[PDB]
Design a protein around this ligand. Structure first.
Ligand SMILES: [N+]
Ligand SMILES: [N+]
Length: 138
């Protein structure tokens, strides 16, 4: 039920016109966090969404990752957060999918990466190749 609830909330984005409502992003994040026991399933669902969705939903998909990781780090502690480490496994592939967004959305992705870097959400060994991937598209 926890994962089913999260999946329903996440996939409801495809019925919406971005930018996505703060309240909707909060509901998605809250569902993810309540389902922390099943964090692996939550990560897998978000990655699947990003792989399969229309280009208009790539930035929203990244905002889901960002919102989950930020809330988890706040709520459980940066060292105890299980979400950023799990997202890190497939992150290179995830961003390859994300960069299939419309051209003027690339900057929105880089902004998120810039903020992750400033706040040490991932180490440079993760952040730098993601940044390099943005630079290579141009
Ligand atoms: N966590
Ligand atoms: N945690």
């Amino acid at each position: 039920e926890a994962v089913k609830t999260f999946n329903s909330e996440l996939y409801s984005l495809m019925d919406m016109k971005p930018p996505i409502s703060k309240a909707k992003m909060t509901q998605i994040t809250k569902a993810a966090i309540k389902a922390i026991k099943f964090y692996k399933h939550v990560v897998q669902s978000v990655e699947k969404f990003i792989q399969k969705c229309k280009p208009e939903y790539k930035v929203p998909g990244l905002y889901v990752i960002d919102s989950i990781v930020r809330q988890s780090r706040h709520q459980f502690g940066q060292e105890k957060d299980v979400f950023a480490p799990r997202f890190s496994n497939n992150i290179i592939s995830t961003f390859q999918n994300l960069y299939r967004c419309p051209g003027d959305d690339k900057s929105k992705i880089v902004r998120v990466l810039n903020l992750w870097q400033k706040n040490n959400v991932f180490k440079s060994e993760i952040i730098q190749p993601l940044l390099d991937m943005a630079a290579a598209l141009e």
